[PDB]
Amino acid sequence: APIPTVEEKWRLLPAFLKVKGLVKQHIDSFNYFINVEIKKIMKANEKVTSDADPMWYLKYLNIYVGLPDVEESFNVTRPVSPHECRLRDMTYSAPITVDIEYTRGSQRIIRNALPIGRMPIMLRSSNCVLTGKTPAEFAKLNECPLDPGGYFIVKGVEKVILIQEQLSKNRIIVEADRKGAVGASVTSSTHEKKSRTNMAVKQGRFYLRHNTLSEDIPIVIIFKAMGVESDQEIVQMIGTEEHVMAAFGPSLEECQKAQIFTQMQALKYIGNKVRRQKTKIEEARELLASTILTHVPVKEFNFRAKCIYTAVMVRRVILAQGDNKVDDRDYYGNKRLELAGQLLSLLFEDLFKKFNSEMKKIADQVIPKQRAAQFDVVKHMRQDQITNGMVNAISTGNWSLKRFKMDRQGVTQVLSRLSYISALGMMTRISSQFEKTRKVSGPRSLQPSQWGMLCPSDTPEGEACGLVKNLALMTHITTDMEDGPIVKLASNLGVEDVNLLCGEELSYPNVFLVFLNGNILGVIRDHKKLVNTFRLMRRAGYINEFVSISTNLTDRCVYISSDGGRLCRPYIIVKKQKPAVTNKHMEELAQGYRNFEDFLHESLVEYLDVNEENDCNIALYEHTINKDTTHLEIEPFTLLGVCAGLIPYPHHNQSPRNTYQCAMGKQAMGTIGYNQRNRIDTLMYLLAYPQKPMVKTKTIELIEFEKLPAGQNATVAVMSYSGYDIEDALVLNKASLDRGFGRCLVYKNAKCTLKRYTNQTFDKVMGPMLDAATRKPIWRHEILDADGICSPGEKVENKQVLVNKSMPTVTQQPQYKDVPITYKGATDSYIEKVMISSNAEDAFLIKMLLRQTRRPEIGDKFSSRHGQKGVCGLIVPQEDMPFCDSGICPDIIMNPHGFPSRMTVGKLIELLAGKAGVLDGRFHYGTAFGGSKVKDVCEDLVRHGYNYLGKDYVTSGITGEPLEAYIYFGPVYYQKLKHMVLDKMHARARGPRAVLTRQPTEGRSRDGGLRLGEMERDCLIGYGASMLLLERLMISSDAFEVDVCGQCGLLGYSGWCHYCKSSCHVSSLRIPYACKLLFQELQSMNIIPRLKLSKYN
Amino acid sequence: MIIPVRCFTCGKIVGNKWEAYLGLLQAEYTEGDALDALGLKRYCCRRMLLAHVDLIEKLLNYAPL
Amino acid sequence: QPMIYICGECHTENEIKSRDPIRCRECGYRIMYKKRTKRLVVFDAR
Amino acid sequence: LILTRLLVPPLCIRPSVVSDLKSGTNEDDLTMKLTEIIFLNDVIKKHRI
Amino acid sequence: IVQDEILAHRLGLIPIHADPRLFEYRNQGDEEGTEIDTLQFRLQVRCTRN
Amino acid sequence: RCPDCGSTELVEDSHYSQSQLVCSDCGCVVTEGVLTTTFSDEGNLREVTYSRSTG
RNA sequence: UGCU
Ligand SMILES: Nc1nc2c(ncn2[C@@H]2O[C@H](COP(=O)(O)OP(=O)(O)OP(=O)(O)O)[C@@H](O)[C@H]2O)c(=O)[nH]1
Ligand SMILES: [Zn+2]
Ligand SMILES: [Zn+2]
Ligand SMILES: [Zn+2]
């Protein structure tokens, strides 16, 4: 009697994606920021006035962002498209307007619409022009419909704000100190200040440390200062356990040693211990009420809640001092994800505060001494301040908020347009707060808390392994709620007030504390009923479905989380060994009677947080459901991310293999969108004949990658041939490469600017310098047109000019000097298009699109969608390629020796599935934890007449005799990578050098030479090739001849010593230029090296 | 972008059968029987015609025209 | 010498001289491409 | 050990790039430090006078 | 919209029904071609609205 | 002019990433090698404007 | 930022 299984259960994922998923997160965050958060900030900073000249004020009424416009026209707005912005290298922003009212001369004057700045509008947002558009309108606007969007366009470059991952605020963290002292910490962060206060037991007693105190003071003194002076009450609040009292005894003894017994004495001591920023008593009370534990509110200098909080903290510290139940930082249940919305809100608030301060200062400086002419703000309302601030914060990526003391870097990154998959995977990345500070390995390790939230396998391979992560296929990030009805329901459910009873009740085993966003909400008994009723109410809908409730029995604490940034995942509710969702509900969803929102409302599917699933039980499949189950997994393959969703049959391969596969798919070559021809980027790679995979996954079908594939399916034969595939290399077919297989196109952009300087002069394009001998342009200016601009359709060679630009040198007749844009390239390139735009500064921007059609050759890198990266080892002809009975020759021959050590059975399964699919005219599915089984494909093969194991009778093409072993043929989806040998090839002659140190440059683009690092020097020393090392590091790198005076030992010039004013003891000497520079720097530092020369004999 | 004229493995002329395969798709013929009627016995041409994506019209929709 | 260009949306042949505001008639789009050359270009089928 | 004269190095150690694209040049930090030192010496002389 | 190089490759992949026994191999160079060892195929297609 | 033949046919022709002003008649190398800066070096030269450097 |  097996439990019935709903087959259409997977249909819940498309419905969820229709309203949420990969890119909807940033879109919704930006929409909220521009719709509600901006208005709240404007309301908070609605009124600004100056101290001097009272009765003057500037009141803001309502702020608008409007639609995206361009300030190109002469004081005229015009709708501009994101593609036009990319082409013209401008920003895609909308004019921020506001309506204000002020008093010029005591007469109230109002303004209904005044611009104050420009906010870069995110693509596919609420106010974006791309939203609510059909594919036809997208084509008219020159934008791809499948484009994920959600990124900003500033100055033509596409920047994406990565999701920051930090620790949850207002939470006690018990952990070991540096030396190893188990203590506690709490970082109270409110809307104004953020203060971290710690508590240590270095000497058996609890010392509290804060950044505003001279020295850490005992906790009993703080207790006595916060109102509670009775040691009995303090001990009852700390705990009533024998071990608790034994551990707290030392603190009571140290407190009794001193004469501190009253609140006045305790406050006086705290004031004496307070640092400079009874007056001391007042400052101590103020710091205790506001500075210390800002998250704990005090009604009117009533420190009861704060006393209870510190008592619970001390109790947790005492309990941890025994059994090593130390909390871990890598537990994502205590992590928060700040989307671009919160960052933009903070930045806008800071910029608005700065603008208000500047306006108040200008008023204070202008109004009192200018003239009888009444001053108003409109004449100094800076409209470029906010615009430049936002532009810089989005472009440079460095955010420096002084009001919050936040100095972050790398917030924005250039959107990688290597491929559609690359862009879609980069859009859903997550950076960490660590940012490669230490090789801790803790946060870099894969924690079990990442189940269903982040992709376990998707991680960049390199130094950023473990710090950069990607979201799962099915997940959500919660926002902030009002917390009103939550508190109301908590108070109505019988939660006793903490101020009504003493702390002794906190030591009982059945009394459980209840916390609300780090703040002690109160106490409760029989928390099972409380949790059940809260969950039932949330399912009914009276409480927001995103409010999480968790229970920890080790500490007896029920946390109610309602802050934003928390990761949640949908789960089907299971009641009495039967899920709520049924085949009837799935059929209704498929027919369109209901949707995911209806499922959420009917108490069928609910969002669970990390802390909630920590206590709730989940089932993977229906057969796994037991009596003790509360939820059911929607789909297992959703655990993987977008980049990992391309892996066919990933559960049959190794983890490093999947990691390398994702890393190489992030660089895979293929089409970007339907507007890839009109798109002009600095570097683009396209494929000639891209083909969709035969073994495509449900994730592929969801992301619509089949419409924009990034690879081709080739008949690969797993075997060794010619020994040119020894280590991960592969052999390509000459005829296959000739018939168009693997053909790639490299598009580069060459931009030129003709700007007008301060003086009335402009850079001009000169015509082609025709040779009077032949009356034709010279070889360099051969590709130039009549206007001096290279025309499309022609080929460009090395050392050829594209724009014969000439700029003045004055900034009486102007003197123009030529600075043409020469083309640096080993191979020839063809000009596809030449776009000429004009900016508002009368500057002409010219962009020429160079194209290069390259053929796969020796050295090109290739992937097989399984991390089996290889390099083209040899290209053998078709006549040399083996042939089967049907006459099919393999295009790629891979090394079978790579399968044993890597356990890539997934590749064999994919090959067999693809063979069966191409034989039966079908598309097999390689869905993770499922998909087409091996028996089905074996049946297909035996029905179509081919071997049921892939191996087929093959005859050798060289000798013409059959092989003793059968060859494993089949179609595999190979994808070419951007790593090209033509681009990676480098050879450095003498070339140029650097000005400071006369040595070759670093980069290849700047014609740089290789570096014989310290390891190379060590290898040469170990070999003992003294003359080789000398010729390398002295003769061929920085050889130079200096003049040294044998009398003073200083460096001369032209055989003359200026120090001694003589030239008899001066002699030439070979010395490295770097060593000479070091000697000069030391002489400047006053460390004079006196060289005593002597004969070589 | 566009259906290749030659097949990668063997080299049989397949670009001339793209419109015929599209017509068979518009008709009631399935992928398997359509590829069988088109005369593609070996699986290389079947894969070439089945795994091919038609993006030429998607690019012409953006073409200047 | 009559220098000709093409608009980004109208795709009409417009003739403008040097140092002129880049614009196109019967519209206001400011994207102007250059027509393909008339010279003979040789390509290889390899 | 107590210095009364500072040894400004040659220009080979202080490379200067003439950025004609704008009204400025790229100078190293040593040049700016020496300029600030000379300015402070001049200010001290002015205050003494 | 098709690239010039891709178009040239597709055209090269097109077979010709000409009898090869009646022609000869082109010598090294001689891009102009001779009547004996060269064949010329013109392709002029101008698309317009119906 | 060329130091060997005295010709004035001096052309700047870069031969494999090597700027070189060489005569076009006899091929006599007049000057070779150019000192540029390097990126870290570029990074560390700070931008100072004429408004401050000139005085 | 990617690559080994
Ligand atoms: N392509 C590329 N991008 C870089 C490089 N270095 C830095 N970036 C960008 O800067 C961020 C991290 O670089 P960092 O190592 O912080 O830069 P850094 O610490 O100054 O590195 P050093 O210059 O070696 O000190 C990355 O997340 C990138 O955003 C680089 O070398 N190449
Ligand atoms: Zn001397
Ligand atoms: Zn074929
Ligand atoms: Zn037009």
Ligand SMILES: [Zn+2]
């Ligand atoms: Zn000469």
